[PDB]
Structures are given as structure tokens and as C-alpha cells.
Design a protein around this ligand. Structure first.
Ligand SMILES: [Mg+2]
Ligand SMILES: [Mg+2]
Ligand SMILES: [Mg+2]
Ligand SMILES: [Mg+2]
Ligand SMILES: [Mg+2]
Ligand SMILES: [Mg+2]
Ligand SMILES: [Mg+2]
Lengths: 319, 108, 190
RNA sequence: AGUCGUAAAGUGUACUGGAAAGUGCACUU
RNA sequence: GAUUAACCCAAGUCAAUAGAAGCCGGCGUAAAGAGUGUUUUAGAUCAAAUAAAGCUAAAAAAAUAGACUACGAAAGUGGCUUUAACAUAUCUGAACACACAAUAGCUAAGACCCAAACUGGGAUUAGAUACCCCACUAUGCUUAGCAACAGUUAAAUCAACAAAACUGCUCGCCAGAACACUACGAGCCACAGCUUAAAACUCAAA
């Protein structure tokens, strides 16, 4: 399968009409070899349906097409790259389906046929997502898709679709952080009670043609058959955010803020005691089972008190 | 150091010397457990003939078999001496040729 | 024991049993009988005389702790270590101590003063040669006790066991720390 | 490795869920 | 590897092992010397501070003086008045004694004008501003807790680079990479994660 040569940075500057190399405001991975590595780590893609986000110049696109995919849905925001992607599509007829639009609003649930939809408890449904997006867009995207897994909608109408996304090295570590680690944070819990998350490898900044001052991690997500917390996404998000707002103080200092001041002291204690959270646990020392306990007790407290779930302590400190 | 400090500390005290693979003995008797070959560290390239042996002290050790061609098999008795094989890391023992089962190198 | 002391120990409420077992003298034939002896309440197994055990290999202490865990498992004891979530006899922890050398006693006190569930009275059950009295003397002279005087004669009091004439020692203890931010010790006959 | 490709500014520390690095506090030239 | 020839020792030769064989040398940058003062058995010869009360002028913290360089052991001290008040007639000598001082990080309570990591909300390109605006947390606040000393400039000063070299006298410290690496294990946890190490070993370097 012969494909067009990859565009060098010269052609890319000419294409974006910048006429210089220090005005891109973007970093491109123009190394087909690292992209081969990433597509290898994404799994066995033979006759797979790949939803590739943030195509850009097309190193990831070329790497994926080199693997024997069936359909490769591309979603590009910029129109200066559609010409190159159209040349790629013509070089490999029938495999590249290009679309123009934002990945944060694009509806993947209708993109692929309904004959690929496997049940949730069965194997991942032969539909993969691969992404090298701006880090300013991959974090909202992963939050949105985590909500989708919690609701079993969106890209996960086909089942437990696997994701391979590039994040910043720190963000990737935090996504794949263990209990007690110095990178354990909100993002770790939020990703980990819904997915098996693996930080596979780190690409140094020197490998990107405009070299960034950061490293880039590649992280693989596989939705879990049995989520570790069976509560609504927004409730878990609220609990985790209030726990982790004070990362270096005891866990109760952050949990007291879920309740109005009037009943802060007694309600916080009731929460902790109907859970079994030792109040000397600092937030990085809480496993997903501690958060499951807190979420269950908090769901109860909300269900016998309607006003609670909408409470925001800063809206009460304003007055 | 001042004279008072040297009087306090006293004469220099050389640490006890380290015992080598032979534990301070000229040679050691050993039983061959298995024969194999190892590759040198790389300014060099070869397949050096080595064998694992259980020494009379009970410890197991890797030994280098010098010369071209050896007929060592398992359970055979050998005498091993000191001397590092410079290109093999961790191989500090050498088999003595012409003693017990390990015979002399065949002429040519 | 079953006809005199078990009645008081099967009164519902907040309670804890510090069952003490001699490490040298294992298996313990008293272990399968605990469900009837103490009832369905929280239980901590304390392996005593660990200092008198030769160190066969590194990590022998972990092997002893595991062995105690399977010994509890063989009997019909519920093993619920650590955080469990929001009845029958339940073993919360297995802790090796040595009352003579005071090895693991301070860590035992810290563990007892760190959780929500270790609230209420403590009942130090055990066998005769388990070494209960040494542990009672050790725990008596510590911050664990709410001392009103220094002399151990007044700090601990003698009381007749309920429903019997068995006079036994007791000293008053502190509630664990979580119960101030937002109860008596008991030695039972061996 | 090529029988591979190509042409005001800093230092720490803390948090970071719109992190191709940002902000906050303290310092240096 | 064989062969020829040469070299050394020689009734021996010499492979392994073990001894013999070594600190009066240094501590800015190579391994090694500062938080401050007092005292201490010995050794040596070198016998505009600080704390209290009061009081304030421009706009709680102190413009001018201050181009001053004083006080204090150090950190630090520069609005006015008053009251106390600024150890010691040789030097070196504390991990362990007494006073202070600063730097992290958590724990309790308390104040909250203002600012403000995080967290929400508003506006903006065509991956908007990471950057603008609003609101409000942790926090910033307040308590209570966890090389020395004396003399020399004479000499070739002088591995270099710093910071011209010196003596004497005393204390502390230093004898390859290696303040290496590593979790046999231990604690917390409670099946899967976190925190916590020296030594061997290897090398001819660092
Ligand atoms: Mg930010
Ligand atoms: Mg910064
Ligand atoms: Mg001889
Ligand atoms: Mg140095
Ligand atoms: Mg002195
Ligand atoms: Mg404000
Ligand atoms: Mg000194």
C-alpha cells in the first residue's frame, strides 16, 4: 500500500501560511516511527473500526492505515489539512472517511453501523478510538467520555470501546496514579472507577518538531465491566472534588464543605461514621472503596434531604 | 590532624582484606553441574566456554574453561583456581587443565 | 467459663475482645470454641511470646500472621480486616506482641485508638499461659489508661464479675480519637 | 545502527479537570 | 594455533592463593570546616540594641534626615516621650548543658478588610486569551503544639580557576565510582497499592 510521503515542517509552514517556524502555536509528531509504536500499543487493529481524533498532518493517520483497518473515521477541525487527508483517502480507497467538526460535539454514536454493537459484559466491540489532540482539548474530552461510560451512551453505545489518547506526562501519570502516590488526584479516581487505565510510555518533548518544554504520555482506557461505584456521575464528581479540594489536609476538612454551615459539624460526623472512613486519612490515601462508601452514604443523605445536592459553599460565603 | 588528634585516634587501622572467590585458598575442588557458553562484553566477540560448578565449600560458581576444546560433562570432578576472565563479567574462577577429569588440551 | 463468664460477654452493645494466643502453643484448641465463648462480636487475635521465637528466615513474622489468619479461617470465624464498608464472630486484626519486651504493645494501643469500630469496653480473653497478666500490667501503665494517680494499686480497681464472686481487675480507658472531634477495661479468668 | 527521516528572563515549592504547560507564594540578575 | 628463532631463570620453572610492603597527607571548586552566644574536665602561650507603658503627624505602619553605617551574639533595629537597660581584664574547647534564632511540613482552635493557587460563571479565534472580567476557597494573619585565635609580608608568591600568599596553636572532619543500586523484609493497608534500606556485587575508572 503506497501512500504519499509525510509533509515536512517546511511544507507545513507553507500550508499554514505562517512563513516562519516560531509561530505555529502547535506541536506536530512528524515521526512515522513513534506513531507506528503508538498504533502498535493501541492493540490489534486488523479489520477494526478506528475513530481517530485530532488527525493533523496525518502521521497517526498513516500509521493506522498501515494497519489493516476496515473503516477509519477522521474528524479534523482545520480545513488546511483536509487537502492532505483527501490525498490520503484517495491513496487508500474506501478506508478513510473524513469529517469536519469539533470532537467535543461530534456524535460518534451514529457514525458506525449498528452491527458492531456488542453487549457491555462481552469483549470490547472491535471499535477503537485513537487520539493525539491538543492537551487543551483532551482533558474536557476525557471527562465527557467518562460521563458517557457512566451513562453507557455516546461512543460506548457499541459497548466497551477502547481508547488510546495522548496527554501531558504529568496528566497521564495522574490519570494512571495508584493510592498514596504523589500524583493521586481527582482525575485518577474519576478515570479509575470506570476504566482500566494504563500509562504505557512517555515521548520526550524533543521528539516533536516544534519541541515543547514538556513530555507526552500515551494512556490506554478500557471501560470496566463492573464500575467500582454504582452512583450517578455528577454525584461521584462532587464527592471527589470536595475530598480533593484540600489535598494536604485530612479528608474531613474537605468533606465538611458538602453540607451547610448550620449542620456542618454533625452532618460531617454522621457521614464519616455511617461510612467507616478514618478521619486521619489524607485524600491521596483513599481507595475507590472509601469513595464508594462515601458516595453511598451521601446519596442517602441527599435522598432524605432534597436541598443538599445543589449546595455550593462558596455561594453561601458570598453573603 | 594535630599531634593530639593522632594520639587520640591512634595508628591507622587497615580494614581486613576481602576474600575472593576461592575464599583465600590456592585452588578448590568442584563438581560440574552444567556446561554452556557466554558472550563477552563488547569491545570483543566470541563464545567463551564456561561451566557451573559446586565447590567443596558448597557454594555454586561459574568458571571459565581455558584452551581450545574441552570434554567436561556433568558430575565430573575439576580443580578450579583464581584469576579473572577479563572479558566475562562475574567469572572469577578458572578450571585447571590436566587435573582430575579435565585433561590437557589436545596438540593442535 | 461458658456457664459463668459468657453471660456478661454476650450482652448486646459496643464491645471488643482481645483474644490472646500463645505462639509457641499452636494450634489453639480454644479457637474453634470462641463463637460460643464470647459471641458474635469484634475480636483481635494477639500472638504472644514472639520474642522467644527463633528467626528461621527473614519475614517469619508475616508467615506467623498468615498462619494465624488461616487458623481463624478453618474455624467458622468471619475474617474482616481493615475497612469493609458502610451476626457472627468477626476477626478485625491479627497482631504479634510480646508483653515482656513490650514489642508491638504501643502499636497495639495506637491501632486501638484510631478507628470508629473499636469503641466501648475491652475484654482480654485468653488461656492460662497465654501471658494475659503481663499484658494487663503493661497496658495498665501507659497513656491508654485514664490515670487519676500514679500508683498502680489505685489506678486499677477490683470488682466482682457480674452474677458471680470472681473478683477481677479493671481500669478505665479512653474512647478512640474520632469520638471527640465531632468505658472500662476488663480482664477475664484464663 | 542503517538497505532510518530530515533545514524581562530564570530558580525553587504548592495546586492544576479547558495542563504542548498555567497560575499562586517566596527568591536571583 | 603450529613452526623457526630469540629472551629470562634453571633442576627447576611459575599459574593460583596468602603475606611482606602505606597515613606527620588534606578539608573554596576534586572525599573532607560557617546559625549565634555563654559555660564546660582539659590544652595553648596569644595572659536606628532590648522590654514596658503612654502619645502621635501626614496617608494600622513610620515619607525628609539617611550622601548616615551606629546598636545588637545572630536573626534583626531607623515616629516622639518617660522608665528599666546594653555580660565579661588571655585564647581554643558541646552531638551530649542553658539560652536564643531561622527554615520546611502537618495538627488544634480563632479573625477575615484585602489579595489569592484551586473551583464555578461571563467574553472572546475558527483547537478563541494559558493571558481579560466577576465570585469565592486553601493560603497570606493570630496564638498553642509537634573553621576559631595570635603574629608575618619575608621569601621561590604562584598545577590551574577563584579570593595575594604565610606561619604558629587548637578543635571537628576526610581516606575510589558509591550521599551508587537494590525491599530479603518492616509499618500502613487489607489483594494490590504507598512509605521505608544498608551491604555485598561489578568496574578501571570516577
Ligand atoms: Mg489552571
Ligand atoms: Mg511557578
Ligand atoms: Mg613445582
Ligand atoms: Mg567537596
Ligand atoms: Mg570559648
Ligand atoms: Mg477577593
Ligand atoms: Mg572549633
Amino acid at each position: 500500500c503506497r501512500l504519499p510521503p509525510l509533509p515536512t515542517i517546511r511544507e507545513i509552514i507553507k500550508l499554514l501560511r505562517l512563513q516562519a517556524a516560531k509561530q505555529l502555536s502547535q506541536n506536530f509528531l512528524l515521526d512515522l516511527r513513534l506513531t507506528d509504536k503508538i498504533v502498535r500499543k493501541a492493540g490489534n487493529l486488523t479489520n477494526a473500526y478506528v475513530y481517530e481524533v485530532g488527525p493533523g498532518p496525518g502521521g497517526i493517520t498513516r500509521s493506522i492505515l498501515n494497519a489493516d483497518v476496515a473503516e477509519l473515521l477522521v474528524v479534523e477541525k482545520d480545513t488546511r489539512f483536509i487537502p492532505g487527508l483527501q490525498m490520503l483517502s484517495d491513496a487508500a480507497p474506501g478506508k478513510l472517511r473524513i469529517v469536519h467538526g469539533d470532537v467535543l460535539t461530534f456524535k460518534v454514536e451514529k457514525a458506525f453501523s449498528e452491527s458492531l454493537k456488542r453487549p457491555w459484559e462481552d469483549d470490547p466491540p472491535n471499535v477503537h478510538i485513537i487520539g493525539n489532540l491538543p492537551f487543551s482539548v483532551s482533558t474536557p474530552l476525557i471527562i465527557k467520555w467518562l460521563e458517557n461510560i457512566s451513562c453507557r451512551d455516546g461512543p460506548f453505545v457499541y459497548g466497551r470501546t477502547q481508547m488510546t489518547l495522548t496527554f501531558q506526562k504529568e496528566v497521564a501519570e495522574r490519570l494512571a496514579a495508584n493510592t498514596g502516590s504523589k500524583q493521586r488526584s481527582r482525575l485518577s479516581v474519576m478515570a479509575q472507577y470506570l476504566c482500566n487505565v494504563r500509562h504505557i510510555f512517555t515521548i520526550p518533548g524533543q521528539a516533536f518538531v516544534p519541541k515543547p518544554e514538556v513530555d507526552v504520555g500515551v494512556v490506554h482506557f478500557t471501560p470496566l465491566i463492573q464500575p467500582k461505584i454504582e452512583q450517578p456521575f455528577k454525584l461521584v464528581e462532587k464527592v471527589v472534588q470536595n475530598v480533593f479540594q484540600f489535598r494536604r489536609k485530612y479528608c474531613h476538612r474537605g468533606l465538611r464543605m458538602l453540607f451547610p454551615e448550620a449542620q456542618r459539624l454533625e452532618s460531617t460526623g454522621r457521614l464519616l461514621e455511617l461510612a467507616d472512613i478514618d478521619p486521619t486519612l489524607r485524600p491521596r490515601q483513599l481507595s475507590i472503596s472509601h469513595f464508594k462508601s462515601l458516595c453511598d452514604v451521601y446519596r442517602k443523605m441527599c435522598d432524605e434531604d432534597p436541598q443538599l445536592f445543589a449546595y455550593n459553599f462558596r455561594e453561601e460565603l458570598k453573603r | 590532624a594535630t599531634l593530639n588528634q593522632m594520639h587520640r585516634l591512634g595508628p591507622p587501622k587497615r580494614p581486613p582484606r576481602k576474600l575472593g572467590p576461592t575464599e583465600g585458598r590456592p585452588q578448590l575442588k568442584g563438581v560440574v553441574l552444567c556446561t554452556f557458553t557466554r558472550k563477552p562484553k563488547k569491545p570483543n566477540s566470541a563464545n567463551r566456554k564456561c561451566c557451573r560448578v559446586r565447590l567443596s565449600t558448597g557454594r555454586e560458581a561459574v568458571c571459565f574453561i581455558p584452551g581450545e576444546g574441552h570434554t567436561l560433562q556433568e558430575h565430573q570432578i575439576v580443580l578450579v583456581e583464581g584469576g579473572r576472565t577479563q572479558d566475562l563479567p562475574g567469572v572469577k574462577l578458572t578450571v585447571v587443565r590436566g587435573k582430575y577429569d579435565c585433561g590437557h588440551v589436545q596438540k593442535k | 467459663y461458658l456457664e459463668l463468664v459468657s453471660a456478661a460477654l454476650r450482652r448486646p452493645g459496643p464491645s471488643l475482645v482481645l483474644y490472646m494466643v500463645d505462639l509457641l502453643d499452636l494450634p489453639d484448641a480454644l479457637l474453634p470454641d470462641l463463637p460460643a465463648l464470647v459471641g458474635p462480636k469484634q475480636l483481635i487475635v494477639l500472638g504472644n511470646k514472639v520474642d522467644l521465637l527463633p528467626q528461621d528466615a527473614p519475614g517469619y513474622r508475616q508467615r506467623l500472621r498468615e498462619r494465624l489468619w488461616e487458623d481463624c479461617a478453618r474455624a467458622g470465624l468471619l475474617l474482616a480486616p481493615g475497612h469493609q464498608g458502610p451476626s457472627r464472630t468477626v476477626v478485625r486484626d491479627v497482631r504479634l506482641i510480646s508483653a515482656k519486651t513490650g514489642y508491638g504493645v504501643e502499636e497495639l494501643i495506637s491501632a486501638l485508638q484510631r478507628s470508629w469500630r473499636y469503641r466501648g469496653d475491652v475484654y482480654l480473653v485468653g488461656a492460662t499461659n497465654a501471658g494475659k497478666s503481663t499484658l494487663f500490667n503493661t497496658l495498665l501503665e501507659s497513656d491508654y489508661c485514664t490515670a487519676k494517680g500514679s500508683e498502680a494499686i489505685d489506678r486499677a480497681t477490683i470488682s466482682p464479675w457480674p452474677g458471680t464472686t470472681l473478683n477481677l481487675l479493671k481500669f478505665p480507658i479512653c474512647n478512640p480519637t474520632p469520638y471527640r472531634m465531632f468505658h472500662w477495661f476488663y480482664d477475664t479468668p484464663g
